């Protein structure tokens, strides 16, 4: 049901942890999702940009969606990232994702092989009838900014829950004043987005580390001091393109193995030492896991091309 | 070998034509490649952006590469587009494409899931050892500008044939003054790139329509007035994102069926009528095929999502 | 848990119904599984021989397993047919099947590319540690009879629940007297298997049609008159190789569309008219669905090669 | 064309050799194919039962077919094993194999998921129109004997080159007396099949080891005493199911690494010592490779499940 999706305020784009041969580490993944549920996250994106959906084959991606539904689906909404630059793959992945029980789909506009606005309506109308859907706009990654007029045409459809918008707060405000539900896709704008520009909440990378504090930020009212205490951590997470930062941090916290699927590689030791300092300044009690944060050596990280 | 790739001036990024149910039309495709050869095209990109590689399953893509080598590889250089935003996919695709006899690989940087410069080097080093390689920079589509210092680093590998560059002539000139071979990836700049900025030639969309005129433009010296005559056709071809124009034009000339794989959809009737006038203005004798150019009705087009 | 698997007496090898384009018809499939649960079936095999697992790609097979777990897993045991003649595919399919929540795996010995008894131990030891497993012996289909000494070596493993045995009642008796749990794989021997030769129950094709009567046969004591009332129906179901008969019958009952994935084709009209007679003789009230049985025309059946 | 396939007498079902991690060893493979050509083998089956097609993903299989055509197709006929128990897979594999330039297809009847005779005709008619085809009957592996009346029906299609027959010489003679071309698929019968029962030649495992002697046996007339000399080697090659013997022997001769994809595992040391004596008895000069034959230690072998 679309209404239940519209009501979510804190959705985590969860990291996908790996075994040293490159396969998914499901035991670490289950720990991560349980920690999200214990700290009040309401939805998870499975295999989103942060979860490296772009590196998965479809069988391991549908497996990870079905696993998340089967183990956690009664305790958290499971939103499968089933969009694609290929309409055929978007159709196939979305209907299989809904068949294994996911609650909603996250759909990006076709990236790299971008299409016309007419082709973009055709793409989205291919999948929207399948179930509750959030459309995702991030032109810095896709090469194409979805214009609001396209979203307005698509919200005829009762399955469009709303938009994950990365353009910025002026675009968030244009949508929310036109009655479209919006989740900020930018951790470092989401507090203002929520309290000043009518956003419902955030689909977050930073909640992978501090899910309790992100929930506080979206639920307890304007808190501009909590916000600026999180800003240095947010900057660190985006120093190189996401998920490089989160992959590095979860490995330092010991909740994920230091295993990267290429083309991602970790942040260097100088940044890893800043992370040890950030954990101390914010307080280890707010971060996921209970192990002592480690700096790690560069040689701890396994970079895998063939898996 | 690499030197033979570096010598190519006219490389057509060939359109992939379809049967009425979405499968590849190999008879139409073979007609296109033969026409290219007969008009002096010296290389083809198989399954590039123009060839909708992004919409192919890997089995039909490797099949199209091996078929092109088997039928035409003694008459034209066959360059497989075996790049990906996933290093795993780029490694497998590339080694398999070389195993079936392609002469070179085209490698884009990771789009959408963009990585750090260090990750970008690791990605390209994963495939550069496999055979002659052209690196493709198109930040308008990928979200990321490959910096010259990464190219200078990678050019130490003797398998780097050069770069397909879309940033513009000032970037072309920075490479070519330093000894890196460049093909312009922008048809509307390629004449000046070739004669004024040291580009070896072009990896062209427009050559799918007027391969003889593109050949003349790359070999017979500066000719502003020929260039000026082609600019309106080139503008039309990129009115919407490629390959929407070329797919519409080739259906109008009768050399490809009017079948689109989504998310691409044809240009509207007013643009198709403009194309009929472009062909008459330039001269039908310069365009591929023998059939009279047609406007086509909207109803002639078949759009396919499930294939 | 293996003990819970050992205790099952009536497992249905459920048919996989199709839409006219060849995709799975999940709405019909859900009706079928609900009807099994309402008539007391205790387990279902998903994508077994009867379910045409051999014709599925792995993504649709894992999807169908995850779907069955998510919709029915609290009401019936879900046993994924994840075995293969390739050890690599067996490993991959089994661990993904268990990850989406299936309760057990059905594993055939490598068919067609058969291996030595030493290779067969190596194959099974690759997957047995993954969770509760039933080994399936059907030399009439595989070309290789698994010798009891191999099963005895493998029952060291607490995950081996038992064997689905198709060789016949003398082989069932050799296993059960040696303390191996056995499910008869032959509907027309399963009554004697159960009451005279120590079999626990049956993994059945016939239960797809008359699940209530098959449950009666396995639970209520020796009933040789009920058995011989079912014998003509059982013979009909195996007149050509299974699943040809069941696919034809479910279409006649209107619970499945008359759509066959090749290489299967339906029984001819003379056999379909015998089925109408069998339903009347046994009583429509005992068969799945509520629609009036139809003979169907040959032209009702859609035979699909490309899907 | 078909006539050129019908003329072949010596077809080697080539072994597929592996690198230490399970990937294909193309350098070893190319050495094997060159040795076959140099000893007068006239065709190769790529990825047949002997070549472990059953263990390949389709991408590596089409790659191996296109590679063989690209490197050797001007010197030897390349027959792809593109058959399957799934018609969908047989259709796709076969059309793609012909598109990359294979000269013929080898098609087994559906094994394990066996179908009715009518279904069997529908399966083969799905692929026979695609190019020259050899039908493979091996009921010991498939569970089903293709009846002569199905072959007589299918031979009306001019693309049927003939049959690889394993039932024995009486079945060979029934075909050949009626004008159907037969290759014996049984090495230990092929001499008599060739000279006494009208077989055109052999699709051979033993030719991977002694291709010159197999050629002599197929071209230079009856020679019982040469045949008798090879029988012990042929017996050894099928002591366990093929390809276990040939994979062990080629590792002992040094022309393939001692790497097995599961579920195959090497013959034990006593059989390997017997092989060293067979080579000495027949003469090393007749066996492929130049290196001294070795027994190998059990520890030299690498068995791989995950690759
Ligand atoms: Na804590
Ligand atoms: Na914690
Ligand atoms: Na120049
Ligand atoms: Na012309
Ligand atoms: Na022309
Ligand atoms: Na009833
Ligand atoms: Na009923
Ligand atoms: Na003869
Ligand atoms: Na020799
Ligand atoms: Na030799």
Author numbering:
A (entry chain A), B (entry chain B), C (entry chain A), D (entry chain B): 59 to 365
Quote what the paper states about this structure:
The first reaction specific to the DAP pathway is the condensation of (S)-ASA and pyruvate into HTPA by dihydrodipicolinate synthase (DHDPS), followed by the formation of THDP by dihydrodipicolinate reductase (DHDPR). In plants, DHDPS is inhibited by lysine, and thus is a key enzyme in regulating lysine biosynthesis. The structure of the tobacco enzyme shows that plant DHDPS is a homotetramer, made up of a dimer of tight dimers.
The crystals diffracted to 2.0 and 2.2 Å respectively, which is much greater resolution than the structure previously reported for Ns-DHDPS. The general arrangement of the At-DHDPS2 subunits is identical to that previously reported for N. sylvestris DHDPS and V. vinifera DHDPS, in which the enzyme exists as a dimer of dimers. In this configuration the active site of each monomer faces outward from the tetramer, while access to the allosteric, lysine binding site is via a small solvent filled channel formed at the dimer-dimer interface. Analysis of the structure using the EBI PISA server showed an extensive dimer interface (1800 Å2, 15.5% of the total monomer surface), and a smaller interface between the dimers (609 Å2, 4.6% of the total monomer surface). Consistent with these previous studies, our results show that this configuration may be a general feature of plant DHDPS enzymes. Analytical ultracentrifugation and light scattering studies show that At-DHDPS2 exists as a homogenous tetramer in solution, with a modal sedimentation coefficient of 7.0 S and a molecular mass of approximately 140 kDa, close to that expected for the tetramer. An overlay of the (S)-lysine bound and unbound structures showed a surprisingly low difference between the structures, with Cα RMSDs of only 0.29 Å and 0.30 for the superposition of the tight-dimers (i.e. the crystallographic asymmetrical unit) and the authentic tetramers, respectively. The scattering data were compared to the theoretical scattering calculated from the crystal structure, and showed good agreement at low q (q <0.12 Å) corresponding to the overall shape for both the unliganded enzyme (χ = 0.91) and enzyme bound to (S)-lysine (χ = 1.20). The experimental scattering profile of At-DHDPS2 was unchanged by the addition of (S)-lysine or the substrate, pyruvate, showing that there are no large conformational changes in solution caused by ligand binding.
